[PDB]
Amino acid sequence: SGEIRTLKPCLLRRNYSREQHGVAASCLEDLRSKACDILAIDKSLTPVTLVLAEDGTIVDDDDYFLCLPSNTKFVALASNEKWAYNNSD
Amino acid sequence: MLQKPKSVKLRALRSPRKFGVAGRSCQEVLRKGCLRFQLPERGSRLCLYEDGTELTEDYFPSVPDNAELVLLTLGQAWQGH
Structure with a gap:
């Protein structure tokens, strides 16, 4: 009982960096925390939300954070709310 | 958590936001996102997007695949035709 049982290595991203990042968390709350130290960001004082x-x-x-496969791409909006919103004309 | 979550994205009207959560428990999926929007029953009514006529938190309108419910709290019902 040392390693996690249901672990899903997903991929996260940063609002300032356009490159894709990678993290390992079983639950959302874990993805953020683990995505905060792995992302190596200094604006950790900002509430980063999660989107698809x-x-x-x-x-x-x-729910959806786990319903997806291991390889999944996500995005977190840092203090800069500049998020990517798509509008279907 | 569970081992058979259903894909059900949620939606809102007052604020332009959409919470996507795939929970296997119907009433549960809504009780969560729905409560997040802070909407009472009589004060706010939850309905679907296409019809938006009536939606009971009990079960979905024969729409298990996806449940795009748009929170609606007004004197009129939603009618996105």
Whole structure:
């Protein structure tokens, strides 16, 4: 009972860096914390929300965060609310 | 957590926001996002997007695949046709 049982290595991103990042968390709350130290950011004092690069919807529950496969892309908006919103004409 | 979550993205009207959560428990999925929007029953009514006519937190309107419910709290019902 040392390693985690249901662990899913997902990929996160930063609002200032356009490159993709990678983290390892089983629950959203864990993805952020682990995504804060791995992301190596200094604006950690900002509440970074989570959204979907495909649907762009925020998931306040690990539901979708776990319903997805191991390889998944996510985005977190730092103090800069500049988020990517898609509008279907 | 569970081992069979359903894909059900949520939506809102007052503020332009959409909470996507795939929970296996119907009433649960809504009780969460719905409560996040801070909307009472009589004061605020939850409905679907396309029809938006009526939506009971009990179960979904024969729409298990996805449940795009848009929170609605006004004297009129939602009618996105």
